[PDB]
Amino acid sequence: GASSVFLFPPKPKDTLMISRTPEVTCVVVDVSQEDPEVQFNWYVDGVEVHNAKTKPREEQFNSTYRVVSVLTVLHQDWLNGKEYKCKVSNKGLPSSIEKTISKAKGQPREPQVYTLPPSQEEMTKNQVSLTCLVKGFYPSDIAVEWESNGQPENNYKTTPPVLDSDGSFFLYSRLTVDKSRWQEGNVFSCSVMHEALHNHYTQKSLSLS
Amino acid sequence: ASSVFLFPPKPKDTLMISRTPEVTCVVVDVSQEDPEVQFNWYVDGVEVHNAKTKPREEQFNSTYRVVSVLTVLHQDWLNGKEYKCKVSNKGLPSSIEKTISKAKGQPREPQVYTLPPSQEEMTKNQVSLTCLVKGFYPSDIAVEWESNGQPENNYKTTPPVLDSDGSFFLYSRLTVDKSRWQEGNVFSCSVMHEALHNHYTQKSLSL
Ligand SMILES: *[C@@H]1O[C@H](CO[C@@H]2O[C@@H](C)[C@@H](O)[C@@H](O)[C@@H]2O)[C@@H](O[C@@H]2O[C@H](CO)[C@@H](O[C@@H]3O[C@H](CO[C@H]4O[C@H](CO)[C@@H](O)[C@H](O)[C@@H]4O[C@@H]4O[C@H](CO)[C@@H](O[C@@H]5O[C@H](CO)[C@H](O)[C@H](O)[C@H]5O)[C@H](O)[C@H]4NC(C)=O)[C@@H](O)[C@H](O[C@H]4O[C@H](CO)[C@@H](O)[C@H](O)[C@@H]4O[C@@H]4O[C@H](CO)[C@@H](O)[C@H](O)[C@H]4NC(C)=O)[C@@H]3O)[C@H](O)[C@H]2NC(C)=O)[C@H](O)[C@H]1NC(C)=O
Ligand SMILES: *[C@@H]1O[C@H](CO[C@@H]2O[C@@H](C)[C@@H](O)[C@@H](O)[C@@H]2O)[C@@H](O[C@@H]2O[C@H](CO)[C@@H](O[C@@H]3O[C@H](CO[C@H]4O[C@H](CO)[C@@H](O)[C@H](O)[C@@H]4O[C@@H]4O[C@H](CO)[C@@H](O[C@@H]5O[C@H](CO)[C@H](O)[C@H](O)[C@H]5O)[C@H](O)[C@H]4NC(C)=O)[C@@H](O)[C@H](O[C@H]4O[C@H](CO)[C@@H](O)[C@H](O)[C@@H]4O[C@@H]4O[C@H](CO)[C@@H](O)[C@H](O)[C@H]4NC(C)=O)[C@@H]3O)[C@H](O)[C@H]2NC(C)=O)[C@H](O)[C@H]1NC(C)=O
């Protein structure tokens, strides 16, 4: 049953800051009530590690169980491309299913980050859009946030990365703000976190001309 | 089971009275010895027989693929009728059904804005012209670029992204030589969507 194990990477922001906790997550679905205990062995570059935390089976609303195992990884190990392998078995049975994941391969490329004010036509509205164009980046793992006056501005949404013709990625993030706050000269800033940035972070600010 | 896919009509087809929208049922991983793949088609549960099915074509992995196309009425798709494909093999009992319809909900008009390149990008040989399309529902949309009446090809568009208010937005990025932008050429983003007048709007961008 190999189409029922899924292995997920850490969130981009978690791998870029050593104070955060990046985790690789091995999920087993379609677990039967007649299945003996689900068991996990984890390996980093083929060497077994023992710090994973496995949660008890959780029943889903389709008469199956789901079992999750979570492994904390060393930021540097993930970014250096180490391979993470989850081996799933049932207690007292011999067979197993194995899944592997690692960061995408290829030379990392630094994102270029541009901020764009609202279209003049949008200035007629009650709220305006501030746009952050992030391009030229590789791999696609990236985090984008906005702030103003120290505080996180959370009325924003960000597109998934999109693959460009030269093999790098781009995306846009759109922050929506009251026109009054923009008209008043408030400074807004787009922060971007990516492994190929110096100190893994950059920011670009934008305010009324 | 996972080997059948059912695709919606193209955004432009449902929106132009001159075009013909259709839904497309596709079956893959069809073994060489498999009996004839058959299709039954239903519109809101009612069987229809006007579909047109194409014979099995081999793929690089030595499996086969079969395709059935059903023409749909514009109003049927736009009114939210459900299209069901039922795939089976001649003389065998099982069947696999897939259904598709337009997302339900009050349609909402796309607000379309064009943005010039960032001043910081102006130092490069090529620059980015941006078209923001937001506030639209459902997500079916077509976005194109032109200059001086003529289609431009060097652009990429993000998929529609679900916004916190339940509508969608996207961005389209047209890459042009710095010299063409500085020459004062006029660029235009065009958007087709059901909640636009004439189903079409165009916004210009120039220096
Ligand atoms: C019974 O129910 C269960 C449970 O479902 C739930 O309950 C039922 C009752 C319904 O209510 C249902 O709606 C509920 O969701 C069913 O279980 C599901 O089983 C299917 C398979 O049958 C699984 O399908 C895969 O989904 C993957 C994506 O999963 C994520 O996204 C969906 C939403 O889009 C979420 O619902 C999932 O939970 C996953 O969400 C992610 O979860 C991660 C782990 O927790 C999160 O990461 C962690 O997050 C924490 C913070 O929270 C930390 O940050 C950690 O550091 C971090 O690790 C992550 O953030 C979160 N994301 C989101 C967006 O929420 C698909 O990737 C996968 O597709 C692959 O495989 C397909 C083949 O099946 C193939 O078609 C795809 O192309 C893709 O193939 C892969 O492609 C890549 C490259 O393209 C290759 O490299 C791969 O090799 C290749 N793999 C292949 C080919 O195998 C599947 O579609 C589904 O995930 C699972 N749901 C849950 C909740 O577990 C079950 O099926 C039901 N049984 C029945 C009906 O019989
Ligand atoms: C053997 O080979 C064959 C052939 O593949 C080719 O050869 C091999 C060797 C490879 O090199 C391969 O790269 C080659 O392409 C393999 O066949 C493939 O099989 C996989 C499954 O394993 C199929 O994957 C699904 O793809 C869906 C999208 O497919 C489209 O987009 C891809 C681009 O990546 C194209 O390749 C496809 O052709 C599809 O393209 C679309 O085609 C439509 C009709 O042909 C077009 O619409 C029509 O267009 C015409 C134009 O002439 C008219 O305008 C008509 O009016 C119009 O209707 C359409 O434009 C076109 N799109 C584009 C972009 O061009 C995925 O959607 C799908 O994912 C879903 O399903 C997964 C499993 O069920 C699931 O895990 C996913 O999460 C996802 O789930 C769905 O999600 C949506 C929303 O996200 C929900 O709405 C659904 O409910 C939900 N379903 C669920 C949950 O069940 C699949 O990943 C692949 O399409 C197929 N290729 C081809 C060419 O058919 C075969 O697998 C090989 N065998 C092996 C390896 O063993």
XYZ file of C-alpha atoms and ligand atoms in Angstrom:
636
model
C 0.000 0.000 0.000
C 2.588 2.574 -1.130
C 0.045 5.106 -2.372
C -0.956 5.673 1.273
C 2.285 7.116 2.715
C 3.073 10.777 2.143
C 6.181 12.628 3.200
C 6.188 16.451 3.531
C 9.014 18.982 3.769
C 9.574 21.656 6.406
C 8.009 25.111 5.894
C 10.523 27.468 4.126
C 10.615 29.999 6.973
C 11.424 27.253 9.518
C 14.612 26.127 7.775
C 15.955 29.646 7.367
C 16.060 30.655 11.060
C 17.840 28.373 13.524
C 15.531 29.499 16.343
C 12.541 27.941 14.509
C 11.709 24.259 14.262
C 11.694 22.700 10.814
C 10.027 19.289 10.645
C 9.593 16.583 8.071
C 6.231 14.859 8.403
C 5.413 11.297 7.414
C 1.679 10.634 7.107
C 0.055 7.247 6.774
C -3.536 7.144 5.581
C -6.122 4.404 5.079
C -4.969 2.629 8.217
C -7.425 -0.181 9.076
C -8.864 -1.028 12.480
C -7.587 -4.563 11.651
C -4.007 -3.248 11.104
C -1.494 -3.833 13.905
C 0.370 -0.751 15.238
C 1.950 1.438 12.581
C 5.697 1.859 13.093
C 8.264 4.307 11.743
C 12.004 4.242 11.205
C 13.610 7.425 10.062
C 16.986 7.896 8.378
C 19.122 10.870 7.499
C 21.426 10.075 4.559
C 20.774 6.376 5.369
C 21.737 6.636 9.019
C 18.986 5.842 11.471
C 17.842 8.619 13.842
C 15.599 8.259 16.871
C 14.128 11.640 17.775
C 10.875 11.422 15.830
C 7.520 11.855 17.596
C 4.737 9.639 16.496
C 1.122 10.474 17.268
C -1.544 7.827 18.103
C -3.894 6.868 15.236
C -6.624 9.448 14.593
C -9.895 8.312 13.116
C -11.003 10.070 9.909
C -14.636 10.623 8.836
C -14.407 7.904 6.196
C -13.954 4.926 8.484
C -10.136 4.888 8.322
C -7.263 5.927 10.651
C -4.430 8.355 9.979
C -1.077 8.096 11.732
C 1.527 10.862 11.688
C 5.234 10.841 12.533
C 7.164 14.057 12.820
C 10.927 14.399 12.656
C 12.730 17.619 13.686
C 15.587 18.348 11.314
C 18.797 20.351 11.536
C 18.373 23.484 9.474
C 21.808 23.152 7.991
C 21.230 19.452 7.081
C 18.093 20.218 5.116
C 19.611 23.216 3.303
C 22.749 21.161 2.504
C 20.501 18.708 0.719
C 20.528 15.698 3.040
C 17.972 12.989 2.259
C 15.213 12.184 4.761
C 13.666 8.755 4.623
C 10.629 7.451 6.433
C 10.062 3.695 6.529
C 6.588 2.611 7.499
C 5.714 -0.871 8.777
C 3.223 -2.690 10.962
C 4.289 -4.219 14.272
C 4.954 -7.929 13.855
C 4.802 -7.827 10.056
C 7.905 -7.871 7.827
C 7.045 -5.657 4.842
C 7.489 -1.881 4.633
C 6.986 1.232 2.558
C 9.718 3.822 2.198
C 9.556 7.425 1.110
C 12.369 9.930 0.680
C 12.501 13.691 0.470
C 15.162 16.367 0.210
C 15.479 19.983 -0.855
C 15.345 20.558 -4.632
C 18.717 20.273 -6.393
C 20.249 23.002 -8.538
C 22.274 26.156 -7.929
C 20.365 28.484 -5.572
C 19.560 31.859 -7.050
C 18.832 34.989 -5.112
C 15.396 36.626 -5.522
C 15.088 40.196 -6.807
C 12.373 41.977 -4.805
C 10.472 44.948 -6.206
C 7.669 46.914 -4.666
C 4.916 48.481 -6.771
C 2.503 51.146 -5.566
C -1.240 51.073 -6.432
C -2.306 51.720 -9.985
C -3.432 55.336 -10.406
C -6.827 53.898 -11.393
C -7.027 52.068 -8.080
C -6.514 55.313 -6.128
C -10.256 55.972 -6.608
C -11.177 53.106 -4.295
C -11.520 52.837 -0.493
C -8.654 50.322 -0.281
C -5.585 50.040 -2.470
C -3.167 47.184 -3.333
C 0.544 47.280 -2.597
C 2.390 44.718 -4.702
C 5.633 42.939 -4.049
C 7.110 41.194 -7.082
C 9.688 38.565 -6.132
C 11.603 37.004 -9.058
C 14.672 35.094 -10.202
C 14.694 32.693 -7.279
C 15.690 29.060 -6.931
C 14.681 26.749 -5.370
C 10.980 27.654 -5.078
C 11.003 27.469 -1.219
C 10.319 30.993 -0.034
C 8.474 33.056 2.565
C 7.018 36.563 2.088
C 5.477 38.739 4.805
C 4.538 42.432 5.136
C 4.856 44.913 7.990
C 4.444 48.570 8.878
C 5.497 50.532 11.943
C 7.087 47.408 13.435
C 3.789 45.479 13.410
C 2.928 42.636 10.996
C 0.350 43.677 8.386
C -1.635 40.581 7.817
C -4.290 41.601 5.255
C -2.128 40.186 2.461
C -2.183 37.119 0.120
C 0.685 35.654 -1.952
C 0.620 33.649 -5.187
C 2.390 30.284 -5.391
C 5.799 30.442 -7.099
C 5.488 30.234 -10.877
C 8.209 28.676 -13.037
C 9.879 31.147 -15.397
C 11.435 30.440 -18.795
C 15.027 30.578 -17.419
C 14.224 27.949 -14.774
C 13.956 30.342 -11.842
C 10.621 31.177 -10.112
C 8.598 34.330 -9.476
C 5.555 35.270 -7.456
C 3.557 38.254 -6.337
C 2.333 39.177 -2.924
C -0.572 41.624 -2.580
C -1.189 43.650 0.557
C -4.528 45.417 0.819
C -4.595 48.633 2.843
C -7.069 51.457 3.554
C -6.405 54.256 1.076
C -6.337 56.595 4.053
C -3.307 54.776 5.507
C -1.466 54.972 2.180
C -2.463 58.643 1.562
C -1.166 59.459 5.077
C 2.409 58.531 4.127
C 2.670 55.300 6.119
C 5.663 53.180 5.141
C 4.913 49.520 4.253
C 7.510 46.837 3.854
C 7.675 43.456 2.119
C 10.040 40.985 3.802
C 11.382 38.003 1.862
C 13.189 34.949 3.281
C 15.086 32.644 1.007
C 18.237 30.614 1.438
C 20.121 32.524 -1.292
C 19.681 35.883 0.408
C 22.470 37.201 2.650
C 21.330 36.440 6.238
C 18.403 34.678 4.512
C 16.369 37.856 4.530
C 15.744 41.097 2.755
C 13.137 43.798 2.805
C 11.979 46.559 0.533
C 9.766 49.415 1.565
C 7.142 51.491 -0.257
C 5.238 54.667 0.660
C 3.379 57.497 -1.100
C 5.656 59.475 -3.449
C -10.068 4.840 -10.804
C -7.416 7.604 -10.727
C -7.006 6.940 -14.470
C -9.979 9.083 -15.580
C -9.876 12.900 -15.757
C -12.596 15.323 -16.657
C -11.830 18.864 -17.800
C -13.932 22.015 -17.971
C -14.397 24.090 -21.116
C -11.813 26.813 -21.852
C -12.711 30.169 -20.272
C -12.872 31.880 -23.664
C -15.209 29.288 -25.141
C -17.951 29.694 -22.576
C -17.793 33.489 -22.919
C -17.894 34.148 -26.675
C -21.111 33.376 -28.604
C -18.859 32.685 -31.618
C -16.883 29.889 -29.905
C -18.006 26.388 -28.930
C -17.362 25.238 -25.378
C -16.921 21.569 -24.576
C -16.033 19.222 -21.702
C -13.366 16.592 -22.103
C -13.205 13.122 -20.546
C -9.763 11.529 -20.636
C -8.821 7.953 -19.757
C -5.197 6.881 -19.323
C -3.321 3.673 -18.419
C -5.403 1.630 -20.862
C -3.670 -1.766 -21.355
C -3.109 -3.087 -24.904
C -5.434 -6.077 -24.342
C -8.208 -4.048 -22.641
C -11.647 -4.243 -24.283
C -13.093 -1.121 -25.956
C -13.240 1.886 -23.630
C -16.781 3.279 -23.632
C -18.278 6.567 -22.500
C -21.664 7.539 -21.243
C -22.356 11.246 -20.742
C -24.938 12.907 -18.539
C -26.059 16.517 -18.160
C -27.793 17.025 -14.802
C -28.398 13.254 -14.685
C -29.942 13.137 -18.159
C -28.057 10.983 -20.685
C -26.907 12.673 -23.898
C -25.438 11.057 -26.997
C -23.752 13.832 -28.967
C -20.260 13.142 -27.656
C -17.401 12.368 -30.030
C -14.873 9.791 -28.952
C -11.358 9.316 -30.401
C -9.601 5.905 -30.756
C -6.888 4.714 -28.368
C -3.423 6.249 -28.821
C -0.256 4.751 -27.322
C 2.011 6.692 -24.974
C 5.748 6.607 -24.296
C 5.241 4.222 -21.377
C 3.570 1.694 -23.731
C 0.129 2.322 -22.181
C -2.856 3.805 -24.009
C -5.043 6.905 -23.667
C -8.606 7.589 -24.834
C -10.435 10.908 -25.144
C -14.117 11.846 -25.374
C -15.337 15.344 -26.067
C -18.784 16.624 -25.246
C -19.985 19.922 -26.734
C -21.831 22.016 -24.194
C -24.287 24.918 -24.482
C -22.899 28.222 -23.161
C -25.850 28.849 -20.882
C -25.804 25.281 -19.560
C -22.204 25.600 -18.336
C -22.756 29.139 -17.094
C -25.992 28.192 -15.298
C -24.190 25.531 -13.311
C -25.376 22.299 -14.965
C -23.409 19.207 -13.917
C -21.532 17.213 -16.518
C -20.845 13.571 -15.762
C -18.606 11.199 -17.643
C -19.007 7.465 -17.037
C -16.164 5.322 -18.295
C -16.369 1.520 -18.745
C -15.044 -1.375 -20.861
C -17.161 -3.394 -23.290
C -18.489 -6.579 -21.651
C -17.230 -5.709 -18.149
C -19.370 -4.590 -15.226
C -17.442 -1.878 -13.498
C -17.635 1.829 -14.206
C -15.888 4.970 -13.099
C -17.780 8.312 -12.956
C -16.436 11.828 -12.736
C -18.452 15.026 -12.659
C -17.633 18.685 -13.173
C -19.552 21.929 -13.167
C -18.981 25.633 -12.810
C -18.302 26.743 -9.242
C -21.520 27.848 -7.598
C -21.883 31.313 -6.140
C -22.692 34.903 -7.101
C -20.303 35.904 -9.939
C -18.152 38.908 -9.077
C -16.585 41.354 -11.496
C -12.773 41.329 -11.924
C -11.126 44.689 -11.118
C -8.197 45.039 -13.518
C -5.183 47.323 -12.842
C -1.920 47.750 -14.711
C 1.350 48.583 -12.968
C 4.543 49.904 -14.526
C 7.976 48.466 -13.723
C 9.544 49.313 -10.392
C 12.066 52.132 -10.640
C 14.623 49.683 -9.175
C 13.990 47.318 -12.056
C 14.549 50.124 -14.574
C 18.301 49.404 -14.353
C 17.899 46.155 -16.307
C 17.711 45.307 -20.049
C 14.174 43.869 -19.688
C 11.441 45.180 -17.422
C 8.170 43.748 -15.992
C 4.754 45.149 -16.804
C 2.176 43.859 -14.324
C -1.568 43.302 -14.632
C -3.396 42.751 -11.342
C -6.811 41.093 -11.701
C -8.711 40.791 -8.406
C -12.111 40.347 -6.816
C -13.405 37.905 -9.398
C -15.660 34.874 -9.014
C -15.746 32.098 -10.187
C -12.084 31.501 -10.973
C -12.560 30.744 -14.715
C -10.699 33.615 -16.455
C -8.576 34.439 -19.486
C -5.850 37.139 -19.447
C -3.805 38.183 -22.482
C -1.437 40.988 -23.466
C -1.135 43.094 -26.641
C 0.797 46.087 -27.928
C -0.317 48.424 -30.710
C -3.122 46.057 -31.649
C -0.787 43.019 -31.784
C -0.561 39.994 -29.382
C 2.556 39.971 -27.210
C 3.913 36.553 -26.207
C 6.457 37.025 -23.472
C 4.205 36.821 -20.415
C 3.381 34.413 -17.613
C 0.259 34.456 -15.420
C -0.115 33.123 -11.876
C -2.921 30.686 -11.160
C -5.976 32.280 -9.477
C -5.481 32.496 -5.759
C -8.339 32.312 -3.243
C -8.588 35.554 -1.309
C -9.844 36.010 2.270
C -13.133 37.491 1.036
C -13.997 34.428 -1.084
C -13.134 35.943 -4.465
C -9.978 35.240 -6.506
C -7.057 37.224 -7.752
C -4.068 36.730 -9.996
C -1.161 38.639 -11.532
C 0.110 38.491 -15.092
C 3.673 39.584 -15.859
C 4.697 40.743 -19.343
C 8.466 41.006 -19.924
C 9.563 43.676 -22.414
C 12.852 45.292 -23.493
C 13.623 48.441 -21.535
C 13.901 50.290 -24.865
C 10.312 49.433 -25.880
C 8.947 50.666 -22.604
C 11.024 53.859 -22.793
C 10.016 54.460 -26.394
C 6.503 55.032 -25.069
C 4.842 52.023 -26.680
C 1.374 51.313 -25.348
C 0.732 47.922 -23.746
C -2.611 46.444 -22.970
C -3.837 43.659 -20.653
C -7.105 42.072 -21.709
C -9.315 39.998 -19.434
C -12.305 37.875 -20.246
C -14.683 36.778 -17.501
C -18.435 36.223 -17.192
C -19.006 39.138 -14.794
C -17.574 41.708 -17.233
C -19.655 43.711 -19.707
C -19.418 42.018 -23.123
C -17.353 39.514 -21.096
C -14.256 41.528 -21.875
C -12.264 44.481 -20.642
C -8.877 45.929 -21.612
C -6.592 48.228 -19.624
C -3.653 50.137 -21.073
C -0.170 50.760 -19.697
C 2.522 53.132 -20.974
C 5.333 55.433 -19.754
C -9.998 9.051 4.261
O -9.723 10.354 4.731
C -8.336 10.710 4.718
C -8.226 12.052 5.390
O -8.739 13.084 4.557
C -9.511 13.980 5.393
O -10.674 13.360 5.893
C -11.602 12.919 4.880
C -12.684 12.131 5.609
C -12.089 14.142 4.086
O -12.731 15.036 4.978
C -10.844 14.829 3.462
O -11.260 15.957 2.730
C -9.841 15.222 4.583
O -8.638 15.800 4.073
C -7.819 10.711 3.287
O -6.432 11.028 3.351
C -5.905 11.693 2.203
O -5.401 10.738 1.316
C -4.932 11.328 0.099
C -4.589 10.194 -0.839
O -5.693 9.317 -1.029
C -3.757 12.266 0.376
O -3.486 12.869 -0.885
C -2.227 13.526 -1.048
O -2.309 14.884 -0.761
C -1.028 15.526 -0.871
C -1.166 16.908 -0.367
O -1.444 16.754 0.986
C -1.493 18.007 1.660
O -2.476 18.876 1.150
C -3.884 18.543 1.440
C -4.724 19.721 0.952
O -4.332 20.020 -0.375
C -4.061 18.325 2.929
O -5.366 17.937 3.182
C -3.062 17.231 3.419
O -3.232 17.017 4.794
C -1.665 17.697 3.140
O -1.564 18.888 3.863
C -0.207 19.071 4.229
O 0.121 18.300 5.363
C 1.500 18.401 5.723
C 1.726 17.394 6.833
O 0.963 17.702 7.992
C 1.827 19.848 6.104
O 3.238 19.940 6.275
C 3.647 20.064 7.658
O 2.945 21.107 8.338
C 3.377 21.442 9.676
C 2.447 22.638 10.108
O 1.060 22.277 10.071
C 4.882 21.804 9.740
O 5.089 23.038 9.081
C 5.737 20.685 9.101
O 7.098 21.110 9.045
C 5.215 20.261 7.696
O 5.947 19.004 7.309
C 1.414 20.797 4.980
O 1.550 22.157 5.382
C -0.029 20.531 4.545
N -0.380 21.344 3.391
C -1.563 21.962 3.261
C -1.757 22.746 2.000
O -2.437 21.887 4.124
C -0.512 15.470 -2.307
O 0.828 15.968 -2.336
C -0.497 14.048 -2.791
O -0.283 14.099 -4.165
C 0.806 13.274 -4.598
O 0.422 11.953 -4.798
C -0.712 11.790 -5.682
C -1.060 10.303 -5.720
O -2.042 10.024 -4.695
C -0.395 12.428 -7.077
O -1.589 12.468 -7.849
C 0.183 13.883 -6.913
O 0.630 14.438 -8.163
C 1.298 13.904 -5.893
O 2.284 13.110 -6.481
C 3.540 13.527 -5.947
O 4.127 14.523 -6.784
C 5.418 14.973 -6.349
C 5.832 16.061 -7.310
O 4.709 16.551 -8.031
C 6.393 13.796 -6.311
O 7.648 14.239 -5.809
C 5.838 12.685 -5.428
O 6.702 11.553 -5.441
C 4.441 12.294 -5.900
N 3.871 11.275 -5.034
C 3.174 10.226 -5.485
C 3.016 10.126 -6.976
O 2.700 9.389 -4.726
C -1.833 13.348 -2.505
O -2.796 13.986 -3.341
C -4.150 13.310 1.426
O -3.023 14.073 1.863
C -4.779 12.630 2.644
N -5.274 13.619 3.590
C -4.833 13.736 4.849
C -5.499 14.794 5.684
O -3.946 13.008 5.306
C -8.019 9.318 2.710
O -7.646 9.264 1.338
C -9.478 8.898 2.814
N -9.629 7.537 2.339
C -10.541 7.177 1.428
C -11.436 8.267 0.921
O -10.641 6.017 1.036
C 1.884 6.953 -19.254
O 1.909 8.180 -20.026
C 0.705 8.964 -19.944
C 0.894 10.161 -20.850
O 1.652 11.185 -20.220
C 2.739 11.570 -21.089
O 3.686 10.539 -21.281
C 4.477 10.161 -20.109
C 5.509 9.127 -20.584
C 5.097 11.383 -19.365
O 6.210 11.881 -20.082
C 4.068 12.511 -19.188
O 4.772 13.654 -18.707
C 3.407 12.826 -20.535
O 2.504 13.909 -20.426
C 0.417 9.352 -18.495
O -0.818 10.062 -18.455
C -0.883 11.050 -17.402
O -1.405 10.486 -16.202
C -1.424 11.409 -15.102
C -1.876 10.633 -13.888
O -0.838 9.798 -13.397
C -2.336 12.591 -15.422
O -2.207 13.522 -14.353
C -3.380 14.330 -14.109
O -3.273 15.585 -14.741
C -4.386 16.472 -14.522
C -4.183 17.676 -15.388
O -3.816 17.190 -16.665
C -3.791 18.285 -17.610
O -2.637 19.066 -17.518
C -1.412 18.336 -17.803
C -0.246 19.294 -17.596
O 0.531 18.806 -16.502
C -1.478 17.710 -19.243
O -0.365 16.847 -19.458
C -2.785 16.906 -19.452
O -2.918 16.559 -20.828
C -3.971 17.718 -19.030
O -3.949 18.739 -19.967
C -5.292 19.166 -20.158
O -5.928 18.444 -21.172
C -7.301 18.821 -21.327
C -7.913 17.836 -22.300
O -6.921 17.126 -23.028
C -7.386 20.284 -21.774
O -8.751 20.694 -21.782
C -9.269 20.757 -23.132
O -8.330 21.344 -24.056
C -8.787 21.407 -25.427
C -7.598 21.958 -26.237
O -7.307 21.168 -27.381
C -10.116 22.209 -25.558
O -9.902 23.608 -25.307
C -11.194 21.595 -24.597
O -12.383 22.389 -24.646
C -10.656 21.487 -23.161
O -11.674 20.824 -22.367
C -6.596 21.189 -20.829
O -6.424 22.481 -21.401
C -5.205 20.626 -20.550
N -4.539 21.397 -19.512
C -3.395 22.060 -19.713
C -2.850 22.803 -18.528
O -2.826 22.064 -20.803
C -4.438 16.824 -13.040
O -5.534 17.685 -12.812
C -4.596 15.549 -12.191
O -4.463 15.901 -10.823
C -5.668 15.577 -10.118
O -5.820 14.184 -9.977
C -4.807 13.504 -9.185
C -5.174 12.010 -9.147
O -6.606 11.879 -9.235
C -4.705 14.169 -7.781
O -3.607 13.610 -7.070
C -4.536 15.713 -7.915
O -4.459 16.333 -6.630
C -5.649 16.306 -8.777
O -6.865 16.081 -8.055
C -7.916 16.847 -8.668
O -7.787 18.227 -8.359
C -8.756 19.065 -9.005
C -8.418 20.489 -8.623
O -7.030 20.630 -8.354
C -10.170 18.655 -8.593
O -11.111 19.421 -9.339
C -10.390 17.169 -8.851
O -11.652 16.753 -8.339
C -9.281 16.344 -8.204
N -9.454 14.932 -8.504
C -9.392 13.970 -7.579
C -9.121 14.422 -6.173
O -9.543 12.786 -7.865
C -3.595 14.431 -12.574
O -2.369 14.705 -11.900
C -1.940 13.243 -16.743
O -2.940 14.178 -17.142
C -1.777 12.205 -17.859
N -1.252 12.827 -19.064
C -1.935 12.896 -20.214
C -1.236 13.572 -21.354
O -3.068 12.432 -20.328
C 0.347 8.097 -17.635
O 0.173 8.440 -16.265
C 1.628 7.278 -17.783
N 1.558 6.067 -16.982
C 2.434 5.780 -16.016
C 3.529 6.787 -15.793
O 2.352 4.753 -15.352
